[PDB]
Design a protein around this ligand. Structure first.
Ligand SMILES: *[C@@H]1O[C@H](CO)[C@@H](O)[C@H](O)[C@H]1NC(C)=O
Ligand SMILES: *[C@@H]1O[C@H](CO)[C@@H](O)[C@H](O)[C@H]1NC(C)=O
Ligand SMILES: *[C@@H]1O[C@H](CO)[C@@H](O)[C@H](O)[C@H]1NC(C)=O
Ligand SMILES: *[C@@H]1O[C@H](CO)[C@@H](O)[C@H](O)[C@H]1NC(C)=O
Lengths: 297, 284, 49, 49
């Protein structure tokens, strides 16, 4: 036996703002991969279903999450990383991928969660007095560690003949090329990519989806969604002291057992709906067809 | 206001080993009567504590700060990750009545002793003035939270009378800070008891911190650059595991280590703060 | 037996609802199979003992 | 053959010279010939002229 939910309660913060994706996507000129643009995103509403449905993209690839239903979840600690790359993105920028970029230019985590959005740009000023440069194809030491960025690269040596500048070496490690080569070659390297990194945890959400909230209940079994956290049970008032920095609770083992409401900041306890085993108490069917039923505990 | 002074008193560091303090428990609430293990780098219960006087570190950006001064000699804003260049940025603390903003920026100030800090003309000795900060927006970004300046515990009860604790974490692209201010009875050193700290800020600021210094410069005008007899204590965090005991408002009342004493290790493996007579295999 | 529910037996998340709300159908199925496998082992072990 | 007073000119394609000590091969061919002084970009796969 299990009690079924009567209502679905979806609750999201009081926020009405919008996510500044366009500000990264095509508002201005793009930074090189080494000098990639790290934008922190917070206090906004992000509808990623637009980018999913929208045209003018070569790739819309998610890791850890679906390309769909991205608008059904809230995220925290959200960052948008913007790069200028060659169309050879596949096997260069990916979790667990030992590409040239992954090793010595921009390292992406193996357990990375987020979306990699990329598109070509063959209708730009790159072939009309363009100042596009800053391509890199040389190494230094080892990997750069995930999400780290260099600011120096002034002196580079990697071998013998320690002359602090000899021509018989891998000179000009930074700024290896700029060879857009307009109209010519297999890819002109106009490709731009934005990587959306999301954290999904107990910490307060900073970015919400385009979803409206509904009301609360106090004494009945319901379905619920609190900032992307879903489940079912009876929502009741809590009498325990959750401090201002505490959004979720926990039992002796697991399960939150309580949540803080994103709009009222009140604490509700979550009690699993009533259930129990069901057994039939019967004489033999060769004696009688009348039975009794016991609902356990 | 560049001083570049040598007119200072050099005092050797002092050390103590009893240190059953330093807690930054997770936000997620554990109801009550919960004995829960935890990982991440914490400060050992009997770590060797150093009392310092503006002595350069090397914090690894993972450590705990303590203050035992009176409010009139409260330590002022401290800076993390400062190098002798414009490469790094840091600025964390403002007062509730100095009309300044916690604007994180590069260091282009007096080296080494960038003082700047003063209090108020009412002291009739220190001379009222402020910091001289000259940041450059060219090739520099700025990120900060200006809210957390209300760390002020008023009152004159006790026999000490008050002490402060702050813990700073690296930490993976964030700068998490936990703290607490408490009343205390008559003590000669950190009290032989237990308490726990609460988080103030997350600060999703991706800066690599390798250095750290605190500041208090309440120098008078009686002679040279002479301030009061202030001192502070610091310690370091290490990647050890612990057992935390909640009782019973979702707060920490006790904790046990695993690395210090086989008995403590036993307590952790048995998920108990009490161990009965017998032989227990705790590890290999 | 209860604690084992939190183990996350190779799956991205110990919480079944978290997987269902994050991944697509076939993407979730391959993660759920891992949680099922581990939980089957946990129950079989309990009963055997 | 990688770095000395001799062998002043050294170029690699396909396989990095910094990995060769950890790589094994078979039937390695040594082609010994003389190139005219105008050797600029005369050994690349992207060969023109
Ligand atoms: C949302 O904001 C309004 C003020 O605009 C406030 O009165 C209300 O309590 C907040 N929370 C909810 C659930 O409306
Ligand atoms: C059912 O009950 C009758 C009682 O007379 C008995 O004769 C018969 O054999 C029973 N059949 C079975 C399958 O038990
Ligand atoms: C702390 O370590 C230093 C290392 O030089 C030692 O000299 C000092 O005595 C130690 N302090 C205590 C209280 O053990
Ligand atoms: C829990 O908090 C209440 C005040 O809200 C206090 O009276 C009570 O003593 C606290 N419980 C414990 C064990 O300290």
């Amino acid at each position: 036996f299990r009690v079924q939910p009567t209502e679905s309660i979806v609750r999201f913060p009081n926020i009405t703002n919008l996510c500044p994706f366009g500000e990264v996507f095509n508002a201005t000129r793009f930074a090189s991969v080494y000098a990639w643009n790290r934008k922190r995103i917070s206090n906004c509403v992000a509808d990623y279903s637009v980018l999913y449905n929208s045209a003018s993209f070569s790739t819309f690839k998610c890791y850890g999450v679906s390309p769909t239903k991205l608008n059904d979840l809230c995220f925290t600690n959200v960052y948008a990383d913007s790069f200028v790359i060659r169309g050879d993105e596949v096997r260069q920028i990916a979790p667990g991928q030992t590409g040239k970029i992954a090793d010595y230019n921009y390292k992406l985590p193996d357990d990375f969660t987020g979306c990699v959005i990329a598109w070509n740009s063959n209708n730009l000023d790159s072939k009309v007095g363009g100042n596009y440069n800053y391509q890199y194809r040389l190494f230094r030491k080892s990997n750069l560690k995930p999400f780290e960025r260099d600011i120096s690269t002034q002196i580079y040596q990697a071998g013998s003949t320690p002359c602090n500048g000899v021509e018989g070496f891998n000179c000009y490690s930074p700024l290896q090329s700029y060879g857009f080569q307009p109209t010519n070659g297999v890819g002109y390297q106009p490709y731009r990519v934005v990587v959306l990194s999301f954290e999904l945890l107990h910490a307060p959400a900073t970015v919400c989806g385009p979803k409206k909230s509904t009301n609360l209940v106090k004494n009945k079994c319901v379905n619920f969604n609190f900032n992307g956290l879903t489940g079912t049970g009876v929502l009741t008032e809590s009498n325990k002291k959750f401090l201002p920095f505490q959004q979720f609770g926990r039992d002796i083992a697991d399960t939150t057992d309580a949540v803080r409401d994103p709009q009222t900041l009140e604490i509700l306890d979550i009690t699993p709906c009533s259930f129990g085993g069901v057994s039939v108490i019967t004489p033999g069917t060769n004696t009688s067809n009348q039975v009794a039923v016991l609902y356990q505990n | 206001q560049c001083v570049n002074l040598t007119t200072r008193t050099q005092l050797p560091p002092a050390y103590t080993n009893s240190f059953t303090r330093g807690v930054y428990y997770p936000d997620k609430v554990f109801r009550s009567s919960v004995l829960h293990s935890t990982q991440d780098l914490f400060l050992p219960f009997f770590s060797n504590v150093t009392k310092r006087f503006d002595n350069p570190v090397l914090p690894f950006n993972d450590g705990v700060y303590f203050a035992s001064t009176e409010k009139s000699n409260i330590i002022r804003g401290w800076i993390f990750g400062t190098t002798l260049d414009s490469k790094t940025q840091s600025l964390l603390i403002v007062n509730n009545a100095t009309n300044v903003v916690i604007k994180v920026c590069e260091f282009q100030f007096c080296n080494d002793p960038f003082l700047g800090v003063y209090y108020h003309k009412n002291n009739k000795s220190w001379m009222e003035s402020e910091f001289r900060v000259y940041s450059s927006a060219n090739n520099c970004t700025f990120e900060y939270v200006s809210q957390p300046f209300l760390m002020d515990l008023e009152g004159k009860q006790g026999n000490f009378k008050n002490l402060r604790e702050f813990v700073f974490k690296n930490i993976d692209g964030y700068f998490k800070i936990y703290s607490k201010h408490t009343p205390i009875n008559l003590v000669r050193d950190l009290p032989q008891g237990f308490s726990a700290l609460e988080p103030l800020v997350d600060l999703p600021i991706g800066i690599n911190i390798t250095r750290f210094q605190t500041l208090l410069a309440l120098h008078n005008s009686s002679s040279g650059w002479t301030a009061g007899a202030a001192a502070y204590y610091v310690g370091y965090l290490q990647p050890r595991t612990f057992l935390l005991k909640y009782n019973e408002n979702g707060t920490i009342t006790d904790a046990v280590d695993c690395a210090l004493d086989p008995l403590s290790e036993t307590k952790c493996t048995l998920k108990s703060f009490t161990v009965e007579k017998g032989i227990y295999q705790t590890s290999n | 037996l209860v604690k084992q529910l939190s183990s996350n037996f190779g799956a991205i998340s110990s919480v079944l609802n978290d997987i269902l709300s994050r991944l697509d159908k076939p993407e979730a199925e391959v993660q759920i199979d891992r949680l099922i496998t581990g939980r089957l082992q946990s129950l079989q072990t309990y009963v055997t003992q």
